[PDB]
Design an enzyme around this catalytic site. Sequence first.
Site, PDB file in Angstrom:
ATOM      1  N   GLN A   1      -8.156  -0.105   0.205  1.00  0.00           N
ATOM      2  CA  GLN A   1      -8.897  -0.793  -0.841  1.00  0.00           C
ATOM      3  C   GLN A   1      -8.051  -1.118  -2.071  1.00  0.00           C
ATOM      4  OE1 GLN A   1     -10.836   2.751  -3.381  1.00  0.00           O
ATOM      5  NE2 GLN A   1     -11.886   2.483  -1.413  1.00  0.00           N
TER       6      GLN A   1
ATOM      7  N   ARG B   1     -12.754  -4.314 -11.435  1.00  0.00           N
ATOM      8  CA  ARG B   1     -14.029  -4.351 -12.167  1.00  0.00           C
ATOM      9  C   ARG B   1     -14.498  -5.794 -12.382  1.00  0.00           C
ATOM     10  NH1 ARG B   1     -10.649  -0.573 -14.382  1.00  0.00           N
ATOM     11  NH2 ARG B   1     -11.388   1.587 -14.709  1.00  0.00           N
TER      12      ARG B   1
ATOM     13  N   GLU C   1     -12.694  -3.726  -3.361  1.00  0.00           N
ATOM     14  CA  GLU C   1     -13.754  -2.967  -4.000  1.00  0.00           C
ATOM     15  C   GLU C   1     -14.063  -3.578  -5.368  1.00  0.00           C
ATOM     16  OE1 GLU C   1     -12.944   1.222  -4.271  1.00  0.00           O
ATOM     17  OE2 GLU C   1     -14.297   1.530  -5.947  1.00  0.00           O
TER      18      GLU C   1
ATOM     19  N   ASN D   1     -20.248  -2.242 -13.483  1.00  0.00           N
ATOM     20  CA  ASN D   1     -20.851  -1.334 -14.448  1.00  0.00           C
ATOM     21  C   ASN D   1     -22.079  -1.993 -15.032  1.00  0.00           C
ATOM     22  OD1 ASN D   1     -18.975   0.957 -14.419  1.00  0.00           O
ATOM     23  ND2 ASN D   1     -17.500  -0.610 -15.071  1.00  0.00           N
TER      24      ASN D   1
ATOM     25  N   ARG E   1       0.433  -5.775 -19.590  1.00  0.00           N
ATOM     26  CA  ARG E   1       0.543  -6.149 -18.176  1.00  0.00           C
ATOM     27  C   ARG E   1       0.566  -4.928 -17.264  1.00  0.00           C
ATOM     28  NH1 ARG E   1       3.605 -11.694 -18.596  1.00  0.00           N
ATOM     29  NH2 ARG E   1       3.363 -11.967 -20.868  1.00  0.00           N
TER      30      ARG E   1
ATOM     31  N   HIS F   1      -2.004  -9.505  -9.051  1.00  0.00           N
ATOM     32  CA  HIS F   1      -2.836 -10.384  -8.213  1.00  0.00           C
ATOM     33  C   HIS F   1      -3.159  -9.733  -6.894  1.00  0.00           C
ATOM     34  CE1 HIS F   1       1.455 -11.711  -7.588  1.00  0.00           C
ATOM     35  NE2 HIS F   1       1.129 -11.737  -6.307  1.00  0.00           N
TER      36      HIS F   1
ATOM     37  N   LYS G   1       7.725 -23.098 -10.759  1.00  0.00           N
ATOM     38  CA  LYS G   1       9.102 -22.864 -10.323  1.00  0.00           C
ATOM     39  C   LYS G   1       9.331 -23.040  -8.820  1.00  0.00           C
ATOM     40  N   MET G   2       8.347 -22.673  -8.003  1.00  0.00           N
ATOM     41  CA  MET G   2       8.460 -22.769  -6.540  1.00  0.00           C
ATOM     42  C   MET G   2       7.288 -23.547  -5.942  1.00  0.00           C
ATOM     43  SD  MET G   2       9.631 -18.988  -5.216  1.00  0.00           S
ATOM     44  CE  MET G   2       9.460 -19.653  -3.563  1.00  0.00           C
TER      45      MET G   2
ATOM     46  N   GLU H   1      -3.245 -15.203  -5.154  1.00  0.00           N
ATOM     47  CA  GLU H   1      -2.165 -15.979  -4.591  1.00  0.00           C
ATOM     48  C   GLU H   1      -2.624 -16.561  -3.264  1.00  0.00           C
ATOM     49  OE1 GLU H   1       1.813 -14.144  -4.759  1.00  0.00           O
ATOM     50  OE2 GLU H   1       2.143 -14.916  -2.731  1.00  0.00           O
TER      51      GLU H   1
HETATM   52  C1  LIG Z   1     -15.670  10.409  -7.430  1.00  0.00           C
HETATM   53  S1  LIG Z   1     -16.134   9.810  -9.031  1.00  0.00           S
HETATM   54  O1  LIG Z   1     -17.550   9.305  -9.078  1.00  0.00           O
HETATM   55  O2  LIG Z   1     -15.996  10.941 -10.009  1.00  0.00           O
HETATM   56  N1  LIG Z   1     -15.122   8.608  -9.421  1.00  0.00           N
HETATM   57  C2  LIG Z   1     -15.227   7.399  -8.865  1.00  0.00           C
HETATM   58  C3  LIG Z   1     -15.090   6.304  -9.712  1.00  0.00           C
HETATM   59  C4  LIG Z   1     -15.183   5.019  -9.198  1.00  0.00           C
HETATM   60  N2  LIG Z   1     -15.049   3.936  -9.949  1.00  0.00           N
HETATM   61  S2  LIG Z   1     -15.426   3.787 -11.519  1.00  0.00           S
HETATM   62  C5  LIG Z   1     -17.194   3.705 -11.773  1.00  0.00           C
HETATM   63  O3  LIG Z   1     -14.814   2.515 -11.990  1.00  0.00           O
HETATM   64  O4  LIG Z   1     -14.863   4.940 -12.291  1.00  0.00           O
HETATM   65  C6  LIG Z   1     -15.404   4.837  -7.838  1.00  0.00           C
HETATM   66  C7  LIG Z   1     -15.556   5.920  -6.972  1.00  0.00           C
HETATM   67  C8  LIG Z   1     -15.735   5.647  -5.610  1.00  0.00           C
HETATM   68  C9  LIG Z   1     -16.794   6.103  -4.832  1.00  0.00           C
HETATM   69  C10 LIG Z   1     -16.852   5.755  -3.471  1.00  0.00           C
HETATM   70  C11 LIG Z   1     -17.907   6.206  -2.662  1.00  0.00           C
HETATM   71  C12 LIG Z   1     -18.482   5.363  -1.705  1.00  0.00           C
HETATM   72  C13 LIG Z   1     -19.527   5.816  -0.886  1.00  0.00           C
HETATM   73  C14 LIG Z   1     -19.994   7.121  -1.027  1.00  0.00           C
HETATM   74  C15 LIG Z   1     -19.425   7.971  -1.981  1.00  0.00           C
HETATM   75  C16 LIG Z   1     -18.384   7.520  -2.800  1.00  0.00           C
HETATM   76  C17 LIG Z   1     -15.840   4.963  -2.904  1.00  0.00           C
HETATM   77  C18 LIG Z   1     -14.774   4.508  -3.681  1.00  0.00           C
HETATM   78  O5  LIG Z   1     -13.866   3.807  -3.226  1.00  0.00           O
HETATM   79  N3  LIG Z   1     -14.726   4.848  -5.014  1.00  0.00           N
HETATM   80  O6  LIG Z   1     -13.665   4.384  -5.775  1.00  0.00           O
HETATM   81  C19 LIG Z   1     -15.450   7.217  -7.487  1.00  0.00           C
HETATM   82  C1  LIG Z   2       6.196 -19.454  -7.028  1.00  0.00           C
HETATM   83  S1  LIG Z   2       6.426 -18.905  -8.691  1.00  0.00           S
HETATM   84  O1  LIG Z   2       7.780 -18.283  -8.875  1.00  0.00           O
HETATM   85  O2  LIG Z   2       6.297 -20.070  -9.615  1.00  0.00           O
HETATM   86  N1  LIG Z   2       5.320 -17.758  -8.977  1.00  0.00           N
HETATM   87  C2  LIG Z   2       5.443 -16.525  -8.460  1.00  0.00           C
HETATM   88  C3  LIG Z   2       5.338 -15.454  -9.344  1.00  0.00           C
HETATM   89  C4  LIG Z   2       5.444 -14.152  -8.869  1.00  0.00           C
HETATM   90  N2  LIG Z   2       5.324 -13.088  -9.664  1.00  0.00           N
HETATM   91  S2  LIG Z   2       6.019 -12.806 -11.104  1.00  0.00           S
HETATM   92  C5  LIG Z   2       7.706 -12.302 -10.948  1.00  0.00           C
HETATM   93  O3  LIG Z   2       5.246 -11.658 -11.678  1.00  0.00           O
HETATM   94  O4  LIG Z   2       5.950 -14.022 -11.970  1.00  0.00           O
HETATM   95  C6  LIG Z   2       5.641 -13.933  -7.504  1.00  0.00           C
HETATM   96  C7  LIG Z   2       5.780 -14.985  -6.588  1.00  0.00           C
HETATM   97  C8  LIG Z   2       5.935 -14.670  -5.214  1.00  0.00           C
HETATM   98  C9  LIG Z   2       6.942 -15.112  -4.343  1.00  0.00           C
HETATM   99  C10 LIG Z   2       6.949 -14.702  -2.988  1.00  0.00           C
HETATM  100  C11 LIG Z   2       7.941 -15.144  -2.099  1.00  0.00           C
HETATM  101  C12 LIG Z   2       8.447 -14.313  -1.095  1.00  0.00           C
HETATM  102  C13 LIG Z   2       9.419 -14.765  -0.195  1.00  0.00           C
HETATM  103  C14 LIG Z   2       9.874 -16.080  -0.291  1.00  0.00           C
HETATM  104  C15 LIG Z   2       9.362 -16.920  -1.277  1.00  0.00           C
HETATM  105  C16 LIG Z   2       8.395 -16.464  -2.175  1.00  0.00           C
HETATM  106  C17 LIG Z   2       5.934 -13.874  -2.489  1.00  0.00           C
HETATM  107  C18 LIG Z   2       4.923 -13.434  -3.343  1.00  0.00           C
HETATM  108  O5  LIG Z   2       4.009 -12.696  -2.961  1.00  0.00           O
HETATM  109  N3  LIG Z   2       4.925 -13.834  -4.675  1.00  0.00           N
HETATM  110  O6  LIG Z   2       3.905 -13.365  -5.486  1.00  0.00           O
HETATM  111  C19 LIG Z   2       5.651 -16.290  -7.084  1.00  0.00           C
HETATM  112 ZN   LIG Z   3     -12.254   3.083  -4.736  1.00  0.00          ZN
HETATM  113 ZN   LIG Z   4       2.454 -12.001  -4.549  1.00  0.00          ZN
END
Ligand SMILES: CS(=O)(=O)Nc1cc(NS(C)(=O)=O)cc(-c2cc(-c3ccccc3)cc(=O)n2O)c1
Ligand SMILES: CS(=O)(=O)Nc1cc(NS(C)(=O)=O)cc(-c2cc(-c3ccccc3)cc(=O)n2O)c1
Ligand SMILES: [Zn+2]
Ligand SMILES: [Zn+2]
EC number: 4.4.1.5
Lengths: 175, 175
Positions: B26, B30, B92, B96, B115, B119, B149-150, B165
Site C-alpha cells: 500500500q 490523505r 490507501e 478524515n 518536499r 508521486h 525536459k524529457m 506519472e
Molecule cells: C493502528 S492505528 O489506528 O493506531 N493507526 C492507524 C492510522 C491510520 N491512518 S491515519 C487515520 O491517517 O492515522 C491507518 C491505520 C490503518 C488501519 C488499517 C486497518 C484496516 C482494516 C482493519 C483494521 C485496520 C489498515 C491500514 O492500512 N492502516 O494504515 C492505522
Molecule cells: C521527464 S522529466 O525529467 O521532465 N520529469 C521527471 C521528473 C522526475 N523526478 S524529479 C528528479 O523529482 O524531478 C522523474 C522522472 C522520471 C524518469 C524516469 C525514467 C527512467 C528511465 C528512463 C527514462 C526516464 C522514470 C521515472 O519514474 N521518473 O519519475 C521524470
Molecule cells: Zn495503511
Molecule cells: Zn517516477
Amino acid sequence: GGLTDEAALSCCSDADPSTKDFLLQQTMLRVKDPKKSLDFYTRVLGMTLIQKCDFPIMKFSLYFLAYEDKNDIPKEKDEKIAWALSRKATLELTHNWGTEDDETQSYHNGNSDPRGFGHIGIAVPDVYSACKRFEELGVKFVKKPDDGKMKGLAFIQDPDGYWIEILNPNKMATL
Amino acid sequence: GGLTDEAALSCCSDADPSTKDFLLQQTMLRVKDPKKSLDFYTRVLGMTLIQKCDFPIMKFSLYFLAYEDKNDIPKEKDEKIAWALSRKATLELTHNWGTEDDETQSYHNGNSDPRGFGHIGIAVPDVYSACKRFEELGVKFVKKPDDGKMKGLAFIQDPDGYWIEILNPNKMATL
Ligand SMILES: CS(=O)(=O)Nc1cc(NS(C)(=O)=O)cc(-c2cc(-c3ccccc3)cc(=O)n2O)c1
Ligand SMILES: CS(=O)(=O)Nc1cc(NS(C)(=O)=O)cc(-c2cc(-c3ccccc3)cc(=O)n2O)c1
Ligand SMILES: [Zn+2]
Ligand SMILES: [Zn+2]
C-alpha cells in the site's frame, strides 16, 4: 460523518476499456542519502535494487527498489529498463545530488503539518517476528506491534523518517 | 555527484530469507473529499474500490483502490479484508471526517516546500492516447507528454493535487 457503503459505491465507475492493462507501477520518495536508504531497503526490508538511472545534466539519480528475485533482472541495458519499469509495486527513491552534504536540508514525511502522504505499507506473514528482527537491527519504531489500541500492527521509519506500516492481512483486528 | 553503480551495489545486501514473502502492499494518501477521489481513481484511472473500512470512534474511513477484478472480491466479510490487504500495489485513501466541509483545509502534495513524497506512477500501453483521453476528460496536467525536459512521459494530478506519472515501460529506454 463518513460515507455509507452505498454512498461510496455510487461514486465509483466501472473501468473504461482504454484503461485496460493499466498497472500501479511506482511510488516515489525523495531520499537525502542514497547510501543509507539503499542499506535500509535491501538489508532491513529485503527489497532488491532492480534499476539505477543517472541524469548528470539534471543532477539526480533514481533508484528502483522492488520485491523481485535478483535472478530475474535482465542482463542487457535496454531490456533491463523495460523489465524494471513494468514491475508492479516498485519504490522509486530520488537522490537530488548534494543533499547528503547539506546539514540544513531534510525531507518531510507528510505526518506533521503540512500533512498529505502518510506511509507505505509492507504485508508480512507475522508482524511479531518481523518486528523482533527490526528491534535486533536497531530500527526506529513509531509504533510497536502491541502499542496503543490496535494490536498486531506496527509503524517503523526509514533513514529519512518516512513511515512504513508493517501489517499481517491474515490477522487484522475486526471492524 | 551521484553514486557510481559499484558504490550503489556496495550498499546493497542480498535479501534475508526471513523477508522472502514480504510484499509492498500500500501507499497511503490523505484525501479531502472521498467522493471526488473515488470518481477520479475509478472513472479516470480505471481502478477498483476493493475495500472500505470505517472507524467511527477515530472519525476516519479508509478506501483501498487497486487494479483488480471486482469479481475476485470474496463474499465472506472476514475473507474479504484478508484478500484486499494481501494485494500488491494498492492505494490507501484516508478520509478524515469533516475535511470536505472545511474551506481552510487542504492536503500537501510533497512537490513544493516542504518536499518529501513525489508521486505515484501508472504504467500504460500508450502515453499519448491515454493523455488525449485525459485532456478530453478535463484532467489537470503538471507535464504534458511533449513538454518539459524529457518527452514521452506525463504527469497529471488528482483532486487533491497529488502527482501521478504516466509512463510506457517499453519506450523508456529510448527517451
Ligand atoms: C493502528 S492505528 O489506528 O493506531 N493507526 C492507524 C492510522 C491510520 N491512518 S491515519 C487515520 O491517517 O492515522 C491507518 C491505520 C490503518 C488501519 C488499517 C486497518 C484496516 C482494516 C482493519 C483494521 C485496520 C489498515 C491500514 O492500512 N492502516 O494504515 C492505522
Ligand atoms: C521527464 S522529466 O525529467 O521532465 N520529469 C521527471 C521528473 C522526475 N523526478 S524529479 C528528479 O523529482 O524531478 C522523474 C522522472 C522520471 C524518469 C524516469 C525514467 C527512467 C528511465 C528512463 C527514462 C526516464 C522514470 C521515472 O519514474 N521518473 O519519475 C521524470
Ligand atoms: Zn495503511
Ligand atoms: Zn517516477
